[PDB]
Amino acid sequence: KVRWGQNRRLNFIDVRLQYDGRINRSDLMQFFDISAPQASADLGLYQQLAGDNLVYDTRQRIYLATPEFKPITKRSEATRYLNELQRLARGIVEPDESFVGYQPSTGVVVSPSRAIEADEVATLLRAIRDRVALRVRYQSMDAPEPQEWVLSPHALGFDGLRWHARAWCHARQVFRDFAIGRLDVLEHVFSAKPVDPLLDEGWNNEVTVSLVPHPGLTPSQRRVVMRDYGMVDGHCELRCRKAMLFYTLRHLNLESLAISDVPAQQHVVVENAEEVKQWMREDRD
Amino acid sequence: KVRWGQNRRLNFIDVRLQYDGRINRSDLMQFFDISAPQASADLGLYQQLAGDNLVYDTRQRIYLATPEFKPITKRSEATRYLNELQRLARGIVEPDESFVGYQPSTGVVVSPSRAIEADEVATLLRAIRDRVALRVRYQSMDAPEPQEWVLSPHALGFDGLRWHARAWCHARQVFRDFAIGRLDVLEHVFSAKPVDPLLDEGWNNEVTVSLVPHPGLTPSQRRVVMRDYGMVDGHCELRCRKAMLFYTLRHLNLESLAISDVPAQQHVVVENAEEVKQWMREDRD
């Protein structure tokens, strides 16, 4: 059997062949800090497992991907690789943490936010896991003077820009959202009443947002929008938690539910506008 | 010296102690498919390198993080770990590809898009690296009937939802953007004129968007906004390529430059509105 480390080196060969179209022994030696004989043995094992993927060129002393290349691992897929380029450009990871070979010039939009402390995220995650209540300070636009609350968190949500904790608010007796960047966790409240998170109907009930191309588009433009949004059969059925519906519409700029008279500024419309309106009124209550 | 594999296992111990607050030998054995003696040796090496971070509890047979814990690697930082939770929830990676231990219930907004083929991304990346021209089919809202162009790509951009190639358009004689999900790459055009990407002024000129809290906010609300946006000293200086300015403003909902009379719907305003307007007119030209 192939051990975990060597398998990661086979993944590295596979992804370099897929995107760079070539790999040298020295690329393996430098990334993984292995010897020339081990790196040659890794390339030999890749040749044994998937010989049609690559040829060795003795003039250039390099392995070249063939036109027949097929990745041996799903970890070489395009969504993952584009996500890696985003993480490198945003500085989330360093080049020595990534299998990416050629790094193109990249421009990625910036999401300005408060850097969160690991210790606070950790306290929240463990409180979720252990179903325990936390005394916190929280400040908001409607209540900017920091105020203390007792919260029992049970989930995390990401709205496209920032994270929030989904939690029972013991004072207001509701499940609701708390931006993690606005929370100061102070101590545990072990005497608080246990909360059943299965009672958070907004979090646990999934709903469907049915999206279609704006009906004022020509058939040719419709096909463009369909391809842009990965629509199968002329619509896109987006599934989300009811308590994530508002965030989802904001993330996709779908908050204006009416079908406008301007197709060019509204490529996609929500088919089930009345369901969506109703679901948001229920959840904000 | 510690080898690459064992160092990844030390990283795994560090991140489990930071967020789960505990780790068992069997967690290492199962994730990395190693023997009990090797996993014990990894935990012993972690104890040697950072003994104040953890204690072994013989009653529970588990290693517990201490209140004094300090991560031995920056790879345990919170931005990375929250990014991992996002990638797991979006299905970008599988649990066996991630060091995340406890996985909370998560809700993440959905970005509907066309799944891109690795082979097309690969052809584009290599064309960027080798500075070669490509014959492509492209369809857009303004020109929906697929049309062929000769493009020399030199960079990639991400607008918050989708990727584009930055490229010289040989027919229209301009540098401009092409959504990768709308591109069909057909063949290389080796007889085309070479293009100097240093002549793409929009791509290479960085500009500053100066952001401040809306001036109608009370001082207490201002402090909330400042914390939300990670503002140092009452403003945020966002740096981006001129050719990414429009995408940046759209991603942050800053396209309406005027200072509105409604602080609650416009938490942040652009200080240098006239510079930004001018820079966008230059770039769309």
Residue numbers in the entry:
A (entry chain A), B (entry chain A): 8 to 292
What's the paper's own text on this?
Here, we identify a novel transcription factor, CapW, that is associated with hundreds of distinct CBASS systems. We show that CapW is a transcriptional repressor that binds the promoter region of its cognate CBASS operon to inhibit expression of CBASS genes. Two structures of CapW from different bacteria reveal a dimeric assembly that likely binds a small-molecule ligand to control DNA binding and transcriptional repression. Our two structures suggest that ligand binding to the protein's WYL domain causes a conformational change in the WYL and WCX domains that triggers a large-scale rotation of the wHTH domains to release the protein from DNA.
We next crystallized and determined the structure of Sm CapW to 1.89 Å resolution. As expected from our SEC-MALS analysis, CapW crystallized as a homodimer with each chain possessing an N-terminal wHTH domain, a central WYL domain, and a C-terminal WCX domain. The CapW homodimer adopts a distinctive domain-swapped overall architecture with the N-terminal wHTH domains adjacent to one another, followed by extended linkers reaching across the dimer such that each protomer's WYL domain interacts primarily with the wHTH domain of the opposite protomer. The C-terminal WCX domain adopts an extended α–β fold, and each protomer's WCX domain reaches back across the top of the dimer to interact with the WYL domain of the opposite protomer. The two WCX domains define a groove across the top of the CapW dimer that extends between the putative ligand-binding sites of each WYL domain (see next section). In DNA-free structures of both CapW and BrxR, the wHTH domains of the two protomers are positioned adjacent to one another, with their DNA-binding surfaces aligned on one face of the dimer. We modelled a DNA-bound structure of CapW based on a structure of Acinetobacter BrxR bound to its cognate palindromic DNA sequence, revealing that the two wHTH domains in the CapW dimer are perfectly aligned to bind a palindromic DNA sequence ∼20 base pairs in length, close to the length of palindromic sequences we identified as CapW binding sites. In Sm CapW, both CapWR32A and CapWSQS-AAA eliminated detectable binding of the protein to its binding site in the CBASS promoter. Together, these data suggest that our structure of Sm CapW represents a DNA-binding competent conformation of CapW. In CapW, the tryptophan residue is highly conserved, while the typical tyrosine residue in WYL domains is replaced by a highly conserved histidine (His171 in Sm CapW). This histidine residue is solvent-exposed on the top face of the CapW dimer, and is surrounded by a cluster of highly-conserved hydrophobic and polar residues including Tyr145, Ser147, Trp156, Arg169, Arg183, Phe185 and Arg189 (Sm CapW residue numbering).
